Symmetry: C3
Subunit: 403 residues, 3 copies
């Protein structure tokens, strides 16, 4: 027939890695460091580098078992290899931060089970296998819980107690993938935050990179340069926070995401001219792109301030998440966020007042604090906006009644 | 091959509209009013009518931008048009209920982004775009939050703070659609009630109409005349509440749903002979169909009363929803519902008692109030049903212990 | 084309039944009893047997209506038949445990609606029909709630107030099924525990058996012998608890699951040589297989004890479920479970201490009770593990601070 064709399911990958066929490739490049693998026919070597030299010294390994998957954190180095006709699939951990004399452990998966993806969390490690199993391990080598995956894994990321799994929930058509996300919190009270929700992607695009921001919010990038971030303040939906194609000059130009930071806001990525991944040598330079939510009429003052407001809102939801889970957060960052947002609301209200849009001013005042609304009432008494001042006063009464 | 064939995904639509190819078509017909579009080669006009003349005067617009999507509420008129080679896709709002002198605003979507569906809520508006984005706007023109859709939108509806999105979650086979529902509450505490649950449909049917009842419960109709309603009292499942094919006399006869009302119960729709949608002229007459849940042996007294009981139960769940969300509800309606249900239970218990089904009587008494159970005990002492009276007494003891 | 092919959706089935084409087949074989159907051209008979003769006497029925689906519980016998050109699809219940003189009821489904699956709960019965409807009935014959199914049903099971539905959520490819699970609790507070989550299956396998353990935990088996159980302590994920292929000697050997028991742990199944289901005559013998979670390096002492620990953890989650839902549970079973787990942790800590893996000892002590940690501190003071004793002491301080 001549209709929709099933899209081939994309293969699993480690975020921040370059393809396996390269002689000198990146196994992982994140906010902790870089892991490179030089593999020809004579020898196979793995080199580990840390951005902060104080964390650990440079580590060089002789890749005898031919490790093809790697992840790096401030605690350990995680390595994995598939099975051969003689050896089993192995998970290798270099626990360099351990305070004891045993800084290494390795485990063999059962017969005919191959590791397809790994990720490192805070004090734990996870491995998705060809048996549609997810195996949890402590950073010291204890086997934790095991559960089955609803489909073949695509990529896996970890941060703190959070586990971020993207897998094939179905079969897409006409170039589209059919991906689902399983988001778990592996603390003392186990929670499945997302029960295989559909992962939004740009049409005819595939998954290019997943992970967490340094502050601990799940994020991912598709092959069309669209960067999306979990919106905890919007029912755990996914909000686009950047479009790396706006910084590209041609079709063959791409950006290779390395890390995401919310405070200060910066998207650390490698500019790539001619391909989607940078060559290992010479050392590529990390670029810093700004985040921009895809808002309408962003060239106008209204659209510009509206984008700045909602970007400030979503990039400070992590403070509430750190508070709800007992983590440590700076109360000063929370206060600066509110002041930054109340200033943008106040400037947007003054703009709507100049445009004689007084109903819009009351809508903006609904997002304001009680102090900001009281200030907007006196600004409305000024400039002879008498009815607007009355509507704002009635809004201030309603806000005080909500307490 | 000769097997299952992929079903073509149905295109987005506005509920209560007639096809675009008509010279004189309905853009939207709901419980607020009617919006018609007359478009030939000479001129293009849009006419707005309100069922209640006291709400607003009849509005006539010169459709210069060729708006093809429309929605209507007691607050504003929402219009949208796709992009051309010279103009961008635009969202136009006629805020006629505004108390200020600015009763109009329009916004341009970014390049190559087209509006595919719109809907109006209480004080807000939403637009699903070709970029798989959902854009939220206040009724006054402020851009609110934005998040990505898991698939191409099919239809969109709003009521109060609730957002009702139906989209393609996959690809169906053999005439079946693969639809998912995302139900959000956009109040001060954002909630995603349904994380893309599968939307039940009749086999080989497509989505024909979605929306909310006047009381605020999500409902939808498929192409086979099956009307389904969210069952908040049954874990947010979907319960069939009507079958418009029972009122049709032939295959070519159809009913075109306009609105759904829970108190009093009535399904307002347009009878259509020969097609699925009514012609614009002459003005079609609104028919009132009754709701009937698809219960077994409904011709018998037992099945008839069982259908009346569960229809009364599901059509009063909205009272609990209005109470939990601080909305205003009549306590008298809640009391009349319970009295209506306790009377049906009492008549079903008397029927089971006549049939010497005393175990069934105790099952019916489990659904009764403590006062109704005490009354059933004295009715069981009467007519010499001594063991039944003892079982009902032990049930009354258990009910008092649950407090 | 030459690519992925759509997998034909498997047909609905009753767990514990043998195919319909057999002259003498099992309609259901569970922990309550056996129901056999002998059907040739001369006569059609249904025989009911109870494992405990004290429950009820053996029942013999003349299958005049040609019932093809059956389920059995300690309360009633449930039978169902499809519709013919003269008769409707019927649901028949033999309420043998009733304390009244009416121990039978039957109901007719509407025109062109056929029963596809049934299941028995505590005091209720459910039937999934060809109209994508789920109909609830009390054990005495009262019609309860009705809601629509997101797809064609595959199998259905019930236990207490829990309803376990597996259905087709999509179309799989290359031999894979696309199954979803809807898990409901039908008590006085209706809850949808699983909103159509994807059902994990072994690749290229179909669903072979579903049901609940005697303690009330959902479980299911695929065609590759993998037995999975709901992990309530792991965010309602699914954990493999057995692999019946490890007990098979050849490809043609299979195990036919009958029941699952958590305390004592035993998987009751019928060994089958040459086919997937046992012949009705002679009476097959019920085998008892042990549960084994698929852990790595299970031949080693570490892997063996780690498997025993997590098997003990998951097979005692039902005690917490019985407690949260007011059910009756033995506090002695909960105490024996903790003692069994603290002993395994203590032996694993002593093993890690012998291997000079002191960081791993602290990880194991995190899973210990406060008394077990205090004991591990004195064991660490012994054998001159001074730093380990300090780390365990700081862990004991942190545990006391969590109260």
């Amino acid at each position: 027939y001549d209709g929709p064709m099933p899209t081939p399911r994309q293969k699993p990958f480690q975020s921040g890695s370059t393809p396996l066929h390269l002689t000198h490739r990146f196994m992982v490049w994140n906010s902790i460091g870089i892991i490179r693998c030089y593999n020809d026919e004579q020898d196979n070597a793995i080199d580990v580098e840390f951005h902060d030299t104080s964390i650990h010294h440079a580590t060089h390994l002789s890749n005898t078992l031919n490790y093809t998957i790697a992840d790096l954190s401030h605690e350990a180095i995680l390595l994995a290899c598939e099975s051969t006709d003689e050896l089993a699939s192995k998970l290798h951990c270099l626990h360099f931060s351990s305070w004891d004399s045993s800084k290494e452990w390795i485990i063999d998966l059962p017969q005919n089970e191959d590791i397809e993806a790994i990720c490192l969390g805070q004090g734990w490690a996870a491995a998705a296998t060809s048996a549609l199993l997810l195996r949890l391990f402590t950073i010291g080598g204890v086997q934790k819980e095991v559960f089955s995956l609803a489909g073949p894994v695509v990529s896996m990321a970890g941060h703190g107690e959070q586990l971020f799994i993207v897998y094939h929930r179905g079969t897409g058509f006409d170039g589209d993938q059919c991906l689902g996300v399983q988001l778990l919190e592996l603390g003392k009270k186990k929670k499945q935050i997302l029960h295989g929700d559909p992962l939004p992607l740009t049409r005819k695009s595939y998954l290019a990179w997943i992970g967490f921001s340094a502050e601990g919010t799940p994020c991912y990038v598709d092959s069309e340069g669209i960067v999306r971030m979990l919106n905890r303040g919007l029912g755990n939906t996914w909000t686009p926070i950047c479009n790396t194609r706006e910084h590209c000059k041609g079709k063959s130009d791409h950006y290779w995401v390395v890390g995401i930071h919310e405070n200060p806001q910066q998207l650390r990525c490698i500019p790539c001219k001619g391909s989607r991944f940078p060559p290992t040598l010479p050392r590529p330079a990390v670029a810093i792109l700004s985040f921009k939510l895809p808002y309408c009429q962003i060239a106008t003052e209204k659209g510009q301030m509206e984008e700045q407001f909602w970007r400030s809102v979503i990039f400070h939801n992590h403070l509430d998440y750190l508070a709800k889970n007992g983590y440590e957060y700076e109360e000063s960052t929370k206060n600066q966020a509110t002041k930054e947002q109340q200033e943008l609301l106040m400037k947007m209200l003054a703009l709507s007042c100049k445009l004689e849009r007084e109903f819009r001013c009351v809508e903006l005042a609904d997002l304001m604090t009680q102090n900001a609304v009281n200030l907007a009432i006196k600004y409305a008494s000024r400039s002879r906006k008498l009815i607007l001042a009355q509507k704002l006063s009635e809004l201030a009464v309603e806000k005080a009644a909500e307490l």
